């Protein structure tokens, strides 16, 4: 149990690090979807103006 509680503590520690990097990339998709959403509102006004 001591050798398996240690091997879980070390694998849980690497999993939590890898998970904090998924939280990072998920924040980076969230932050660039603000750019895109804003620009498809603009594409709509120019069509309304000139169609």
């Amino acid at each position: 149990n001591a050798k398996n509680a240690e091997e879980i503590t070390n694998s849980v520690k690497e999993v939590n690090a890898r998970l904090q990097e998924i939280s990072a990339s998920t924040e980076e998709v969230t932050s660039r979807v603000q750019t895109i959403r804003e620009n498809v509102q603009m594409l709509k006004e120019i069509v309304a103006r000139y169609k």
């Binding site: 149990n1 001591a2 509680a5 240690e6 879980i8 503590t9 849980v12 520690k13 999993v15 939590n16 998970l19 904090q20 998924i22 939280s23 998920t26 924040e27 998709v29 969230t30 979807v33 895109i36 959403r37 498809v40 594409l43 709509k44 120019i46 069509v47 000139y50 169609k51």
Partner: protein, 52 residues
């Protein structure tokens, strides 16, 4: 303005899609918050069980 009518056809598909990515990345971020709180529980409990 026919070339701007061509632009609307594209811009409709993008606006429908970006609204789904906006809810799908919010569903991912909430599930990731839930995983983390359970991972800290596994971390906590694997120290208390080792002391036991």
């Amino acid at each position: 303005g026919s070339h701007m009518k061509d632009v609307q056809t594209e811009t409709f598909s993008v606006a429908e899609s970006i609204e789904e990515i906006s809810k799908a990345n919010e569903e991912i971020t909430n599930q990731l918050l839930g995983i983390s709180k359970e991972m800290d529980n596994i971390s906590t409990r694997i120290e208390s069980i080792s002391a036991s």
